[PDB]
Amino acid sequence: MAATAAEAVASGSGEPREEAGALGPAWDESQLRSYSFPTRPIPRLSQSDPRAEELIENEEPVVLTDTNLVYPALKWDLEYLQENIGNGDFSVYSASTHKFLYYDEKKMANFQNFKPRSNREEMKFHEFVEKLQDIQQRGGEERLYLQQTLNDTVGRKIVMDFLGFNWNWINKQQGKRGWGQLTSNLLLIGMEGNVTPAHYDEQQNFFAQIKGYKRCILFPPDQFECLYPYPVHHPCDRQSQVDFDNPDYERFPNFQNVVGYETVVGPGDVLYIPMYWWHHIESLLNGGITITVNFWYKGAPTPKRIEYPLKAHQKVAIMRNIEKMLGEALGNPQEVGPLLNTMIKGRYN
Amino acid sequence: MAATAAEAVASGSGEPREEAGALGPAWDESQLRSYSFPTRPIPRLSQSDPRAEELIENEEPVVLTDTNLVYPALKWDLEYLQENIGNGDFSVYSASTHKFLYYDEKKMANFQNFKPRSNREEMKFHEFVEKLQDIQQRGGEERLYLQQTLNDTVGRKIVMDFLGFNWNWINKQQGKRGWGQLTSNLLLIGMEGNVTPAHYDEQQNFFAQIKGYKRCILFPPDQFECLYPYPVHHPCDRQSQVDFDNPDYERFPNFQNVVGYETVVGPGDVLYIPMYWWHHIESLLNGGITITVNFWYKGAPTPKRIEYPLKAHQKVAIMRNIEKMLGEALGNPQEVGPLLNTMIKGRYN
């Protein structure tokens, strides 16, 4: 029965891998949050495996198990970083719930009624660690999530570790895929259970996991209809409006047609998150703090000759520009929706 | 009671004017078709009246009673034209109903499922008159509507009459309003009861009535939401989808908020139909054949500096371009609707 076959292929992230030296099961299935949609698994391949090279070429997700990308960083932990990370400022988001919804501050102007559920607070790494200990101590409920681009102000050891990254392999991936420059390296340190709601980025990404475990649920760009992103001018642009813990099927009916590609990454794994692909990231429950460093690259320029029919991500590019252009042309981003509705009601819908 | 005051201002075209020499009432109210919406009257002014100059400047409709625009043409009738109009071909639409819905033939390609309710047939003016007599003779039901741009192939008398038009007055109107060139002069000869469904043109127009009477119902460009034009790529682009004889309030709910500006024009009257203004034209029932010659002018170019907020017609210009651009970018006009719906469903609606 094809329905039975499908219920099997929705094997999730699969069986938890058994760590070396029989150190027991890496993670438990009960450490995963429960959702209302099926998910097939993202392939776990070797960087030498031709299939992995193929998936990256067709802009499809893949977890590379042996890149040694951030090998020197696999020894990173709070104590190490606190001594070597430096004394620069670190962006740290604080929330009252596990969901850390991103919000662009430049766009909060056009939406006064928007009240962010988490707050950003600059601080020194030791303060962050301190604040991390305090919550643990007082057994509080407050949650933190450090997200900071790595810069000039990192200790010599951190700089040394950087040199030990497998630049040879990633530089080639950049060159062979025609990708633009490396724009940044986001350091992500979050508490257990922390969740980064579904969204898509406008850059290619090599998600290098360093400490703890993260469950990554991805969705193809052709599932734009099922994820309902906020209006482009909204501070939550590029994020999904659908609450995964409580989907409003009335407002977002197509979310019942959604199918994800999930996987759990651990220390040493590198997940390729293709540009435009939606992704939901969560630090496993009771798995301790997680550490990740990503690599963001500008995408390849638009081809000289356009082929048809257009690919999904191209339509996404187009829909985004339409909203932008309208916003500029009407002089007020608030008039975008009314115009669009007027344009389609009784005409195209 | 404001509701009572409003029910009075909806005086329609008003009291029928009494022609000179006590030749009885020009037209009867029973010669008008019944519709489901209210209509205030379009002003009837003298070209020397400063108000008329004002309405034209603010791109608002007005009927000019004394322009002498097509004075030499006021003697035109079937016999005269048949002798002088020439032997060039004349576009003549034939329909089985009073509604003559315009349809662009260049766009019939993108819509195979479209079957026009009227057919165009080139013929000589005498043939047209002949065919006009035949239907009258056989007492048939078929309807005709001659609509032809006046060209080089008109007799010397028709050319002579043209010279007698009040070019002085209209040339100034062109110059003072910054309008482009005169693109054409459409000759319209239709049978009694014939109707040209609501639509808007992308050119400024001076509707010069020559024979018989026409009821002109206009709607401001800000009533775009209530008229539901066909998709830009549709052969019926710029026409309203709403059947005035039978409004589908389920598909077109905002048609119940529609308010028109109507008037009845007769020989000697010149109606200014501002660019983008919607208009419904009908040759009064049992009023005989009607003759009109319009003057189409390209509009003034877009201002150097754009002011805000945008005027209604500017938003119409924008909505049109969006549909055009999308059509080009997706390579298939049929994909426009699906993209627009995807862009707004659960996002802006």
């Binding site: 962006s91 991103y102 662009d104 501050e105 430049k106 950003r120 997200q147 681009t149 724009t183 940044s184 986001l186 980064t196 969204h199 980025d201 406008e202 850059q203 642009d237 590029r238 963001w296 500008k298 995408g299 638009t302 356009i306 191209q314 590019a317 187009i318 985004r320 520009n321 339409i322 | 651009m325 999308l326 080009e328 970018a329």
Partner: peptide, 17 residues
């Protein structure tokens, strides 16, 4: 022409600026 215009992309990510 306009097609390229509509295809051009941004570089926004899950970070400020």
């Amino acid at each position: 022409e306009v097609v390229k215009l509509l295809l051009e992309h941004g570089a926004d990510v899950l970070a400020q600026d």
